[PDB]
């Protein structure tokens, strides 16, 4: 990575053996899940592609999911060269040569070169871009690794509505639905697979049930006894 | 985060796992509550928009109240852009722009503009501006998940007033109410309702008693004496 | 009506048979209702008082209503003169004299006067100004036939709100009420006619609140709500 | 409307009464259907903010719905100006007329101002920016509730297999859906009376298989419905 | 449309509603046999993506068949952007950006871009390429909504040799197969599926008898001549 210490210029130095040991531990414990992913961003700060390959190469678990992540990388990069032209003139004074997708995976680029792009001013953000495409590569596994579908959701026989709204959102964390499909899921599919008596309170909102309306709903008399007031 | 420097002007440093684990720890003990608003604020020191979102993202549970934080973010970001008009034309050499709704919420947050707003003079804490909205939203989570009114304080038929007062004071943390308003509560309610051995202690204290004197009030009243032990 | 030339002098052209023919499809079908007027105003795009008199001449229908309309047009002319202090004022050599009401109506004036005023620098818009007296004359003859007005409208007992909001707006189209009176209706009779859940929010937020907040109300269930849990 | 595009200098004209009659005919029969947006888009080609305001002026049905489209216009013209620069002050680089939201709704602009903007080369797309908010006002009228959701569509045994599908695709004309929701319905509700031998065929085709491929399938298996033949 | 394309005269006219209606009538009655594609070609003379986009969306009915055609043209845009080389090194640009798959189908391209591909010298063929993607969509519809297959066309034991042919040809018009395959079906398969007395008559005619005589040949089936045939 790239680091600042007590120096005058940025220091290019390798990833820590401590940070790779912490990395494999979360992967042994947790596989790939949506909690893994901001764990991932925080240890890949100021990454070169060489630091990212080192994380990918240290993993010895999940061998089949990892080959699907490299097929996803090959695809985002392949989209990267089509969407942003790679024909150019000659390289002007002051400037460095320009990344294309195999440069962003670091397959064509070398280490001194990759570092040299990200210490340039404004930086050319070769690790940042490659990090984003591997979060997408994570997202594809994390989606398959989930223990249940979003479409099979329904409320526990005595589950509070609040805790089911919560659970439904938690299963919805890595889920790549559009804003209107996410709203139809919340206002239809969630409600429709609810308790009948909470469904009937919620019925009387009409069109456009909010999150603030959902939370405040179903607070009635009867049912379960209250928790004591001196705890 | 962005972190003060011995040998220069401010510098970036990556968000540690230890900081991650310590936020998620108080969530496991006591979740969204009055307690966890200064704990998240104690850990917010030097964080950017991205580190603060990284902090929210690493959390497994607690996700419908997080949906109401996202909802709350959505409310304030529209308000700040509605409040503050856009400048026409371009910003002068070595000056920085206004913080926009999308930048304080983190969607348009990039490091070099983060570092621009921290090397300006006065420096601009774009992370405190974001933090204020997140602890603004944690207040609303507390109100949404509240059982009933703050002025419902219960007591048992032989209690010596000490936990009863603490329970009042704990109950009132949801409010911002004056310390003189609380004392007045104590005169009008807590002293009034006291069990009669403790009530006899309280009555001879004087009606214009100070908060110090009320700490030594009912100390040793009733019970199987003292089961507490010196440490 | 007038046709713009970018290579030389303006062209003024008689009223077209297809303009008059489309006029006849409207006038003898929509007759004593407000539905003539916004289309008439559309046919009157870029019109001279002569063209408009020619569209009047093309109507053979409703002679005693058309005489009633002519009386309003005469009286509207008569009143343009009384809003004007100086009749036949001094004005520099080669421009167009200021128009009186009868000149605007087109019976003391020539076409070259009437195009003459329109094409002036600044424009004197006698075409639009006549049209405005005409459309006041059309609303009155709606209103002599059908005395239905914003103040008569009351909605049925099983009818919840949304049918009445249509009812108001369709009526308001040829309305004759004066500005203070129209405000009194929106603060008085709209609030009283409103059904209860909308009615409460109308008494709180006012009619200067958005129509949406009103239109989201009344889909709920009568009374103030079943009681929340016994704490 | 502004006419003469790609024929030198652009110049103004009047809105055609048979463009208006088709627009009125579109309101009478297809207001609640997404057919309105393309029709209005094309009918309003070349049309000024005033011609767009006349389009609204002309029409008489569904006023509560339509006034909520004016709330939509009021709200968007405010929302536009907090995204953009605004021409503010008497100063030299700020004093000039530039198109802020009220100009684009044509409330403070005259028609001549709007022609000037729109007859520029490249034009300044004032009637288009306003038209996008007319389209949102309509999209919100379309997006009003419709009896029959995609779950209120399932196979029955007395028709071709194809016509039940064809209805599912009518339902999803204004209703929003994911590919996973659509794939769930060929596991759930659109395969209810599907043949034993054919369910495997349909399932073997799976998520990847096209609509072509699903609606060709089953010529060997099952009764008359599967081969597209009447009961 | 933009018309007068061939001689570079490029004049813009917005679409009539009579041509959109003309289109839904073509979809509604002329799309299950290949008369839709020449009527469409003429109707799409000078059509821009905006124009063709407007026509696809205003069909309203015919949803499954539309969906199959959408999926067809969405497959063409994937293919288009897969097809092209990624060009690198020196390129001299010239006027007008590379239109991608989505640009071609109007979805990432504005009418003002569309006016660029049309105004270019030679005009760049984006509306032309999109119109024949739609004809790929309409070919699979002729196929899908076919009543019979060419092999199962057989002479009726009460049908004329001329009627048998007339139906065998028109089937053959709408069979998808390549031009030699259809030469083979004219030359061999036609003669194959004719009833024996007619096949026996055919031998007897040989090369000797001309094509007109065949139209009058094998009579006395269905009853006397050919017209009084039993139904």
The three-class DSSP label of residue A2 is strand
Q: How far A184 CA lies from chain D's nearest CA (Å)?
A: 8
E strands present in chain A: 2-3, 11-12, 86-87
Which of D145, D149, D184 is opposite residue A151, by nearest beta carbon? D184
What's the token pair of residue A178? 């559009």
Q: Which two tokens stand for residue C52?
A: 């408009």
Helix (H) or strand (E) holding B11: strand B11-12
Q: Which residues of D touch E10 (CB under 8 A)?
A: 6
Cα angle at A211 between A205 and A217, to 5 degrees? 55
Judging contacts by C-beta atoms under 8 Å, the chain B residues touching residue D82 are 81-82, 85-86
Q: E150 near E189, Cβ under 8 Å?
A: yes
Tokens of C107: 């019976």
E17 vs D122: CB contact, 8 Å cut-off?
A: no
Specify the residue for token string 């494999």.
A24
> Which residues of D are less than 8 Å from C169 in CB distance?
63-64, 67
Provide the 3-class DSSP secondary structure of residue B89.
coil
Closest CA to C15 of C42, C53, C41: C53
> Who contacts D90 (Cβ-Cβ below 8 Å, separation ≥6)?
none
SS (H, E, C) chain E: CEECCCCCCCEECCCCHHHHHHHHHHHHHCCCCCCHHHHHHHHCCCCCHHHHHHHHHCCCCCHHHHHHHHHHHHHHHHHHHHHCCCCEECCCCCCCCCCCHHHHCCCCCCHHHHHHHHHCCCCCCHHHHHHHHHHHHHHHHHHHCCCCCCCCCCCCCCCCHHHHHHHHHHHHHHCCCCHHHHHHHHHHHHHHCCCHHHHHHHHHHCCCCCCCHHHHCCCCCCCCCCCCCCC
The three-point CA angle D32-D34-D37 to 5° equals: 105
Residues of E in contact with A89 (CB under 8 A): 90
Measured CA to CA, the distance from residue C20 to residue C52 in angstroms comes to 11
Residues D100 and D87: beta-carbon distance below 8 Å: yes
Please state, in angstroms and rounded to a whole number, the distance separating the CA atoms of residues B6 and C74. Answer: 88
Contact B118, B8 (CB under 8 A): no
Kindly state the helix (H) or strand (E) to which residue C216 belongs, with its residue range.
Answer: helix C211-216
Burial class from Cβ neighbours inside 10 Å (0-12, 13-18, 19+) for residue B197 reads: middle
Residue A164: partners with Cβ closer than 8 Å, 6 or more residues away: A155, A156, A190, A194
Which residues face A12 on adjacent strands? A2
What are the structure tokens assigned to D55, written together? 């389009």
**Cβ–Cβ gap D178/A181 under 8 Å:** yes
Could you give the 3-state DSSP secondary structure of residue C3? strand
- Which of left, alpha, beta for A206 (phi over 0: left; psi -120 to 50: alpha)? left
Q: Which residues pair with D12 in a beta bridge?
A: D2
Contact C37, C30 (CB under 8 A): no
* E68·D38 Cβ contact <8 A: no
Contact between B168 and B153 (Cβ < 8 Å): yes
Q: How many whole angstroms separate alpha carbon B97 and alpha carbon B89?
A: 11
d(CA E195, CA E204): 15
Q: Pick D38's closest partner by Cβ from E57, E65, E68.
A: E57
Residues in chain A, overall count: 231
Contact residues on chain B for D84, CB-CB shorter than 8 A: 86
CA-nearest of B157, B139, B147 to B195 is B157
Spatial separation of the C-alpha atoms in residues C155 and C146, rounded to whole Å: 19
Residue of B nearest to D80 (CA): B82
Give the nearest partner residue to D42 out of E12, E14, E66, using CB atoms: E14
Q: How many other CB atoms sit within 10 Å of the CB of residue C36?
A: 22
The answer to whether C135 and C37 are in contact (CB under 8 A) is yes
Residue of A121, D104, D41 whose CA lies nearest to B112: A121
Asked whether the beta carbons of residue D54 and residue C38 sit closer than 8 angstroms, the reply is yes
| Cβ contact, residue pair A38, B57, below 8 Å | yes
Here the tokens at position E98 are 């590379």
Determined by cryo-EM
Pairing between strand E88-89 and E11-12?
unpaired
Cα–Cα distances (Å) from A99 to A11, A81, A87, A199, in that order, read: 22, 10, 11, 54
Distance from CA of E82 to the nearest CA of A (A): 8
How many helices (H) and strands (E) would you count in chain A? 12, 3
What is the 3-class SS of A26-58, one letter each residue?
A: HHHHHCCCCCHHHHHHHHCCCCCHHHHHHHHHH
Q: Which of B81, B82, B88 has its CB closest to that of D85?
A: B88
Smallest Cβ–Cβ distance between A178 and the set D149, D151, D176 belongs to: D176
Are D160 and D219 in contact by the 8 Å Cβ rule? The answer is: no
What single DSSP character describes residue D3?
A: E
Q: Do residues A15 and A111 make contact, with C-beta atoms less than 8 angstroms apart?
A: no
Residues of D with CB under 8 A from a CB of E: 5-7, 22, 30, 33-35, 37-39, 41-43, 45-46, 122, 125, 162, 165-167, 169-170, 172-173, 210-212, 215-216
Which residues make Cβ contacts (< 8 Å) with residue E126, sequence separation at least 6?
E48, E49, E99, E103, E104, E109, E114, E117
| Eight-state DSSP code of residue D191 | G
Q: What is the CA radius of gyration of chain E?
A: 24
Q: Please enumerate in sequence order all residues whose Cβ is within 8 A of that of B103, keeping only pairs 6 or more positions apart, or say none.
A: B49, B109, B113, B126
> Is the bond leading into C122 cis (omega within 30 degrees of zero)?
yes
Three-class SS of residue D15? coil
Please, what's the b/e burial string for C140-153 (b: 16 or more CB within 10 A of its CB; e: otherwise)?
bbbbeeeeeebeeb
- Residue D68, Cα to own-chain centre: how many angstroms? 17
Angstrom distances, CA of residue E29 to CA of B62, D215, E11, E25, E36: 57, 21, 32, 6, 9
Would you call A204 and C221 a contact, using CB atoms and an 8 Å cutoff? Answer: yes
Cα D48 to Cα D126: distance, rounded to the nearest angstrom = 8
- Provide the 8-state DSSP code for C56: H
- C55 CB neighbour count, 10 Å cutoff: 19
Residues in E closer than 8 angstroms to D170, CB to CB, are 61, 63
Q: What are the C-alpha distances in Å from C75 to residues A1, B88, C100, C147?
A: 86, 51, 13, 22
> How many CA atoms within 13 Å lie on the side-chain side of A30?
18
CB pairs < 8 Å spanning A and D: 19
In sequence order, the 6+-apart residues with CB closer than 8 A to the CB of E19 are E43
Chains E and B touch (3+ CB pairs under 8 A): no
Contact by Cβ (8 Å): D34, D28: no
CA B231 to chain centre: 31
Phi/psi of residue E88, each to 5°?
-125, -175
Q: Which residues contact D169 (CB under 8 A, 6 or more apart)?
A: E63, E64, E66, E67
Pairing relation of β-strands A11-12 and E11-12? Answer: unpaired
Q: How far is residue E183's CA from residue A103's CA, in Å, rounded to a whole number?
A: 54
Residue A227 has which token pair?
């928790």
Q: Which of C177, C145, C150, C143 is nearest to C165 (CA)?
A: C150
| Contact between E52 and E131 (Cβ < 8 Å) | yes
CB D32 within 8 A of CB C134: no
Locate B16 and state its tokens: 């540690």
β pairing state of A2-3 and C11-12: unpaired
Which residues in E lie closer than 8 A to residue A83 (C-beta atoms)?
100
Subunits close to B (at least 3 CB pairs below 8 A): A, C, D
D-contacting chains (≥3 CB pairs under 8 Å)? A, B, C, E
Determine whether A141 is exposed, middle or buried from the number of CB atoms within 10 Å of its CB (0-12, 13-18, 19+): buried
Q: Show the DSSP H helices in chain B as ranges.
A: 17-30, 36-43, 49-57, 63-83, 101-104, 111-118, 126-144, 162-171, 179-185, 191-193, 196-203, 211-216
Report yes or no: B198 and B160 within 8 Å, Cβ to Cβ: yes
């Amino acid at each position: 990575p790239i680091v600042q210490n007590l120096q005058g210029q940025m220091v290019h130095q390798a990833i820590s053996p401590r940070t790779l040991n912490a990395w494999v531990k979360v992967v042994e414990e947790k596989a790939f899940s949506p909690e893994v992913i901001p764990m991932f961003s925080a240890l890949s700060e100021g990454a070169t592609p060489q630091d990212l390959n080192t994380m990918l190469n240290t993993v010895g678990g999940h061998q089949a999911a990892m080959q699907m992540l490299k097929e996803t990388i090959n695809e985002e990069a392949a989209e990267w060269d089509r969407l942003h032209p790679v024909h150019a003139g000659p390289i002007e004074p002051g400037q460095m040569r320009e990344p294309r997708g195999s440069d962003i995976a670091g397959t064509t680029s070398t280490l001194q070169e990759q570092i040299g792009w990200m210490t340039h001013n404004p930086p050319i953000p070769v690790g940042e871009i490659y990090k984003r495409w591997i979060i997408l590569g994570l997202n594809k596994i994390v989606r398959m690794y989930s223990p249940t579908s979003i479409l099979d959701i329904r409320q526990g026989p005595k589950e509070p509505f609040r805790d089911y709204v919560d659970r439904f959102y938690k299963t919805l964390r890595a889920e790549q639905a559009s804003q209107e499909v996410k709203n139809w899921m919340t206002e239809t599919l969630l409600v429709q697979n609810a308790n009948p008596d909470c469904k009937t309170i919620l019925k009387a909102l009409g069109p456009a049930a909010t999150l603030e309306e959902m939370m405040t709903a179903c607070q009635g008399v009867g049912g379960p006894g209250h928790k004591a007031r001196v705890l």
